[PDB]
Amino acid sequence: GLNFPTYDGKDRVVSLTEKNFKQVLKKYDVLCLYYHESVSSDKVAQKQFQLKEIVLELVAQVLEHKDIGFVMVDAKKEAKLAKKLGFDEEGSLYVLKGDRTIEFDGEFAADVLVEFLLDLIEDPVEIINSKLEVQAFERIEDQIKLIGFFKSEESEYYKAFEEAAEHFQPYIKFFATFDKGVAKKLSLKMNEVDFYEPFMDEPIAIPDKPYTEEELVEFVKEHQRPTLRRLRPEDMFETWEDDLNGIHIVAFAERSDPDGYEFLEILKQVARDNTDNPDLSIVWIDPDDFPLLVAYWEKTFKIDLFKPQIGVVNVTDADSVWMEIPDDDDLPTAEELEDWIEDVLSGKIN
Amino acid sequence: GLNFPTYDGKDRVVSLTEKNFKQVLKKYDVLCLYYHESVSSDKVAQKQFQLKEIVLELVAQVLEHKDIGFVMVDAKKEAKLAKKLGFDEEGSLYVLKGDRTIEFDGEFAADVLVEFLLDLIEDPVEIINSKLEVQAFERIEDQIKLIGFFKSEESEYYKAFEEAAEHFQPYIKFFATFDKGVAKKLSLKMNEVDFYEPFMDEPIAIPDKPYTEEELVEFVKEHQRPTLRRLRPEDMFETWEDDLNGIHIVAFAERSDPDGYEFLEILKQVARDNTDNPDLSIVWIDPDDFPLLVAYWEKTFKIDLFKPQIGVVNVTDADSVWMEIPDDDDLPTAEELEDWIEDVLSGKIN
Numbered sequence: 001g002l003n004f005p006t007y008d009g010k011d012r013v014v015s016l017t018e019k020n021f022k023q024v025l026k027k028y029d030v031l032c033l034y035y036h037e038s039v040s041s042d043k044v045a046q047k048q049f050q051l052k053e054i055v056l057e058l059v060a061q062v063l064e065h066k067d068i069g070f071v072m073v074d075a076k077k078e079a080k081l082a083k084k085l086g087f088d089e090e091g092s093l094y095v096l097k098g099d100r101t102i103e104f105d106g107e108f109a110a111d112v113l114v115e116f117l118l119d120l121i122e123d124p125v126e127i128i129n130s131k132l133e134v135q136a137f138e139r140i141e142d143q144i145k146l147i148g149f150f151k152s153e154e155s156e157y158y159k160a161f162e163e164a165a166e167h168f169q170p171y172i173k174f175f176a177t178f179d180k181g182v183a184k185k186l187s188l189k190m191n192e193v194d195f196y197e198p199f200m201d202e203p204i205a206i207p208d209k210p211y212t213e214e215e216l217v218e219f220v221k222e223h224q225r226p227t228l229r230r231l232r233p234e235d236m237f238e239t240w241e242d243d244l245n246g247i248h249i250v251a252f253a254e255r256s257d258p259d260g261y262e263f264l265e266i267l268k269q270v271a272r273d274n275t276d277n278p279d280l281s282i283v284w285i286d287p288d289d290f291p292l293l294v295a296y297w298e299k300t301f302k303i304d305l306f307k308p309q310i311g312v313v314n315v316t317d318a319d320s321v322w323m324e325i326p327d328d329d330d331l332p333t334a335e336e337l338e339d340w341i342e343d344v345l346s347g348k349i350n
Numbered sequence: 351g352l353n354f355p356t357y358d359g360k361d362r363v364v365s366l367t368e369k370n371f372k373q374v375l376k377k378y379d380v381l382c383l384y385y386h387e388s389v390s391s392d393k394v395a396q397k398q399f400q401l402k403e404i405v406l407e408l409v410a411q412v413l414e415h416k417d418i419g420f421v422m423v424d425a426k427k428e429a430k431l432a433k434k435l436g437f438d439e440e441g442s443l444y445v446l447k448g449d450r451t452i453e454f455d456g457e458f459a460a461d462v463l464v465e466f467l468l469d470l471i472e473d474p475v476e477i478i479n480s481k482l483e484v485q486a487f488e489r490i491e492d493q494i495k496l497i498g499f500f501k502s503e504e505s506e507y508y509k510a511f512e513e514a515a516e517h518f519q520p521y522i523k524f525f526a527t528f529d530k531g532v533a534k535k536l537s538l539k540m541n542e543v544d545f546y547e548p549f550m551d552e553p554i555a556i557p558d559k560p561y562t563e564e565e566l567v568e569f570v571k572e573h574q575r576p577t578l579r580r581l582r583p584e585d586m587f588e589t590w591e592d593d594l595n596g597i598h599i600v601a602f603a604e605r606s607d608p609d610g611y612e613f614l615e616i617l618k619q620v621a622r623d624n625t626d627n628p629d630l631s632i633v634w635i636d637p638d639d640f641p642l643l644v645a646y647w648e649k650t651f652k653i654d655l656f657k658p659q660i661g662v663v664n665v666t667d668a669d670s671v672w673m674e675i676p677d678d679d680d681l682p683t684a685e686e687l688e689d690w691i692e693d694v695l696s697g698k699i700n
Contacts, residue, residue: 001667001668002646002650002668003590003646003668004643004646005642005643005645005646006398006458007397007398007401008394008397008398009393009394009395009396009397009398010394010397011394011397043359043361044358044359044360045359046359047357047359047360047361047404047407048351048356048357048358048359050400050404051357051404051408054397054400054401054404057397058401058642062642062645062646063645065649066645108356110642111641111642114641114642114645115641118645132609135608136607237353240354291412291461291464291465292355292408292412292460292461292464293354293355295412295413295415295464296354296355296412299415
């Protein structure tokens with residue numbers, strides 16, 4: 001009687017062609033498009049694509065009716081109906097929806113994608129009214145999140161807020177409320193929006209309310225790189241290119257293993273203490289979310305990931321300089337961690 | 351292909367034949383075997399095998415630096431070997447550590463399998479050398495654990511605990527201490543073992559002090575069904591196949607959705623009371639642990655898994671029954687719960 005999403009074997013990721021084009025884009029609400037080009041029976045390349053293709057048919061199965069559309073676009077055949085779609089570089093997974101095209105960076109894995117797609121499908125702004133609502137919003141701490149108080153769903157400034165929201169889906173969170181009490185509690189004024197940078201207590205208030213679409217958007221583009229940020233799988237790839245200065249100050253910490261949890265609660269202090277520093281952005285990778293990679297990192301970095309760590313790694317010529325506290329050592333604290341971060345240049349360009 | 355890493359298309363899982371059976375056996379510590387059907391008789395049954403194949407090719411890539419061998423054995427071309435290896439269930443992933451053959455009845459994913467295998471390459475009895483380490487021994491609530499005080503490794507009573515331990519890897523955790531100080535904290539007389547069932551308050555001592563391998567294997571088997579068993583990805587299937595007379599009293603509750611926490615805590619206390627009840631075995635499923643499945647269950651289970659819930663999903667006839675449609679957000683008492691279960695359990699469900 002069915003049971004469990006164990007792949008069917010079936011074929012749901014069809015290929016776009018100028019033939020079907022018409023009727024595919026106007027058959028589906030969201031349409032997920034993976035642009036590629038596969039070389040001969042270069043079994044490596046065939047095996048490398050076969051993974052991606054399988055992931056998509058399993059995502060396609062999980063979300064069969066929900067109505068997203070899963071297609072394939074080749075770069076040697078169908079290369080003009082691809083530039084007549086926008087697709088500037090091979091291998092990427094695009095999604096067309098509020099008609100726009102979200103670029104999906106992030107691990108190519110079916111569970112990730114399903115969550116991704118199942119967020120684009122919902123609308124950009126989540127509205128709050130109750131205590132479990134306001135409390136579940138007050139819960140998110142590791143995602144950027146903007147909340148704004150408005151008059152109505154038809155508030156012309158609310159409508160600017162939802163339009164700004166679209167430019168950032170699924171990755172950033174916009175929420176609104178119309179209820180007066182909720183806003184008393186969350187300390188918002190009328191048409192005012194508060195910006196919560198992750199792992200800081202305080203929300204910075206977006207200045208000089210009411211705001212324009214383009215003002216809200218400018219701000220979220222200004223404040224988009226938090227002082228400490230989590231390496232989430234939704235966007236793992238996007239944050240690994242958002243280079244701070246050529247490097248990444250990376251910090252590992254398992255937030256269950258109590259040396260790691262503890263190491264984290266220090267990490268947020270340096271983060272709260274050095275917010276307005278432009279040049280300091282810490283990516284925290286909880287090793288428990290990245291198995292595959294834990295092995296790879298542990299070995300190309302010359303550290304023990306089953307312990308806490310924080311170092312500098314250059315995004316280009318692959319070497320790292322870890323605060324290996326060089327025996328191994330068991331410490332730190334903020335004053336000691338800031339000073340080593342502050343000193344990364346003595347451990348660099350002198 | 352350039353990211354941080356992906357899957358190199360290369361071919362690591364290799365086919366097992368008698369021509370090389372000796373050579374690879376006396377070559378790896380763990381051998382991981384996929385016992386499959388045949389080649390291609392009907393194509394969309396070769397798509398599913400490519401799911402099962404592309405995963406094993408990725409697991410093998412990550413765990414390359416490990417002493418694990420990934421091999422496939424064909425039920426048709428090699429029926430000599432499968433008979434000597436003891437493989438009869440086509441479609442199965444078996445691993446071989448020593449003279450023990452371990453079947454994987456879990457969610458066939460590359461992350462689940464990297465977890466499973468790493469936990470299997472490990473030594474089966476975990477030694478607690480210090481009071482300190484005891485506090486972490488007591489962390490584990492949702493898994494069956496056994497601890498024993500033995501005079502040392504060298505003793506026949508540890509020897510044959512270690513042997514009982516390998517029958518059950520990696521599903522049931524076995525620990526051991528040889529410090530008198532740790533023993534007095536856990537309360538074990540010399541050569542005394544304790545069985546800790548998930549979610550209960552005290553242990554069950556294993557009774558006729560001391561034991562042999564098959565005296566221990568017989569007690570675990572005898573008490574290895576918990577009243578509140580947590581559904582896990584590493585053994586999910588194995589759990590669903592073990593019914594409690596056709597049905598399954600299934601319970602949803604997200605452990606961090608605070609209601610889910612509070613509902614789980616009353617689930618544990620009804621289970622703590624009716625622990626005595628032999629038909630009763632509640633499977634709780636943290637929905638945040640099963641994404642693709644929350645979508646599956648998002649068509650047939652019309653129910654709302656963001657909320658608490660509990661009911662009788664019938665394995666045999668594909669249907670399902672849930673807790674009351676009066677039952678609102680009004681979260682039950684321990685008392686109300688039992689009360690729901692006994693005329694379901696005993697009487698017609700309704």
